[PDB]
């Protein structure tokens, strides 16, 4: 009766960009991206992979309220390394592990019985 529709968790709305990038005004060379219509599924995966990049000083995400499918990613990189690239290499890195994971699973499946 006051409930939001359930598509509102994955469907974007009236002019809501998927990513929103804002210059962090606390530390230098840091940025805080807002991910509309996403959650721990994505956030935890991007943050954990950003923590393997050894030129990333700081990386953490957070769902400010569970009512809303959205989360903030905060990223700080070493001087000269633009944080967006730190995000980009991060995503790609995941995608490559995932692909390898898929094929590796397939070949394993194609060897079974029942």
């Amino acid at each position: 009766m006051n409930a939001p529709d359930r598509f509102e968790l994955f469907l974007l709305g009236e002019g809501e960009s998927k990513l929103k990038i804002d210059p962090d005004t606390k530390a230098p060379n840091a940025v805080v991206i807002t991910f509309e219509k996403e959650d721990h599924t994505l956030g935890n995966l991007i943050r954990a992979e950003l923590l393997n990049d050894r030129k990333v000083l700081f990386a953490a995400y957070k769902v400010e309220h569970p009512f809303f499918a959205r989360f903030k990613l905060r990223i700080q990189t070493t001087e000269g390394y633009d944080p967006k690239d730190a995000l980009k290499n991060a995503c790609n890195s995941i995608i490559n592990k995932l692909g390898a994971l898929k094929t590796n699973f397939e070949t394993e499946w194609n060897l079974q019985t029942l």
Binding site: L42, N44, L98, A100, L101
Partner: protein
């Protein structure tokens, strides 16, 4: 092959017990979530009812209809109705099916999901057929009729995501376990006299080496191996729940990549 590593232990129409070596915790988790809430499926999502002189209420039935697992193998070539250009539904983004039941006998007439009859044009796509793992071939007991009772209704199955309703889950239950000797000290076992004698041994302990008291705490170690078991409802074979899961996760990681390029424009 290269990175993350799979090792089936058991396989079946309904289950894949495996081991997922060389992966982040985060990824092995994010995969299980996606497997639960984000691989799409077809399921009844509208019921127009013509006659229901049955003991049950309209929507009460409508509800169970939603829960009946429909074949979703070729789902990727059906469309989201919200995306389709046609007004309401069509034969390119929705399967329509019919249910007719009338009690003839003196004995109670049952209505199964076998009694569901596809009507719209599947056009070759492997879609919409109610899953039946039942042994006598009538999976799922929709409703029961007395003598003069009738039930006549029409259901439009749509492509949906479990995030939006748990009907559209291919999921069921996903088993998941790492570090079966707490060698990472990720829990602190509650006990009364003895942690070891009181907590039972995980079946995944024949697969790892028990720690030695002659050894101190390995603090550098991370979570590496992961013992999953994906069970499927059947609207998608098992192997596919995991694959499409990895596919979808990857797919949505990607739209983030693309979205970064969309912003760069002047």
């Amino acid at each position: 092959e290269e990175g993350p590593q799979v090792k089936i232990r058991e396989a079946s129409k309904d289950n894949v017990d495996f081991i997922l070596s060389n992966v982040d915790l985060a990824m092995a988790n994010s995969l299980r979530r996606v497997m639960i809430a984000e691989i799409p499926t077809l399921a009844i999502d509208s019921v127009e009812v013509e006659t229901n002189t049955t003991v049950l209420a309209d929507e009460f039935i409508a509800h169970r209809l939603g829960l009946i697992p429909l074949q979703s193998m070729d789902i990727e070539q059906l469309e989201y109705s919200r995306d389709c250009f046609c007004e309401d539904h069509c034969d390119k983004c929705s399967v329509v099916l019919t249910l007719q039941a009338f009690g003839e006998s003196e004995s109670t007439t049952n209505v199964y999901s076998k009694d569901l009859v596809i009507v719209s044009n599947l056009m070759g796509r492997n879609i919409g057929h109610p899953i039946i793992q039942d042994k006598e071939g009538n999976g799922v007991l929709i409703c029961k009729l007395r003598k003069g009772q009738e039930l006549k209704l029409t259901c439009v199955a749509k492509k949906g995501i479990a995030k939006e309703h748990a009907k559209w889950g291919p999921a069921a239950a996903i088993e998941f376990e790492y570090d079966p000797w707490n060698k990472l000290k990720h829990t602190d076992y509650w006990y009364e006299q003895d942690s070891a004698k009181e907590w039972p041994q995980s079946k995944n302990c024949e697969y790892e080496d028990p720690p030695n008291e002659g050894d101190p705490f390995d603090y550098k170690a991370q979570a590496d191996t992961f013992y999953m078991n994906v069970e499927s409802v059947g609207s998608i074979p098992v192997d596919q729940v995991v694959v499409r899961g990895i596919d979808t996760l990857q797919k949505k990681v990607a739209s983030i990549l693309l979205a970064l390029t969309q912003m760069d424009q002047d």
